[PDB]
Amino acid sequence: MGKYDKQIDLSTVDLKKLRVKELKKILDDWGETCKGCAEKSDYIRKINELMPKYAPKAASARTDL
């Protein structure tokens, strides 16, 4: 098997590598979006604020074991 391996990626994604439109997607999927935000890093803050509320599958840190 190759080219496809998973049905989720928010568990392992890098919000710094994404763009504002891709951060807006994560926020809109939970139904929760900022209204005075104007910089890419503030959408990363609004995600990390709400990821433990709606995505325990991604709020937890990685482990080598």
From Swiss-Prot:
Disulfide-bond pairs as recorded: C34-C37
Effect on the protein upon substituting R62K: 14-fold decrease in secretion
Coiled-coil annotated residue ranges, if any: none
Protein origin, superkingdom: Eukaryota
PTM comment text: May contain sialic acid residues.
Cell location: Secreted; Endoplasmic reticulum lumen; Sarcoplasmic reticulum lumen
Description of what induces expression: By endoplasmic reticulum stress. By hypoxia. Induced by the ER stressor tunicamycin.
Region (Interacts with ERN1, EIF2AK3 and ATF6): 3-41
Subunit comment: Interacts directly (via SAP domain) with HSPA5/BiP; the interaction inhibits ATP binding to HSPA5/BiP and subsequent nucleotide exchange. Component of a complex containing at least CRELD2, MANF, MATN3 and PDIA4. Interacts (via C-terminus) with ERN1 (via luminal domain); the interaction is decreased in the presence of increasing concentrations of Ca(2+).
Chain's role: Selectively promotes the survival of dopaminergic neurons of the ventral mid-brain. Modulates GABAergic transmission to the dopaminergic neurons of the substantia nigra. Enhances spontaneous, as well as evoked, GABAergic inhibitory postsynaptic currents in dopaminergic neurons. Inhibits cell proliferation and endoplasmic reticulum (ER) stress-induced cell death. Retained in the ER/sarcoplasmic reticulum (SR) through association with the endoplasmic reticulum chaperone protein HSPA5 under normal conditions.
Recorded family membership: Belongs to the ARMET family.
Protein name: Mesencephalic astrocyte-derived neurotrophic factor
Organism encoding this protein: Homo sapiens
Gene name for this UniProt entry: MANF
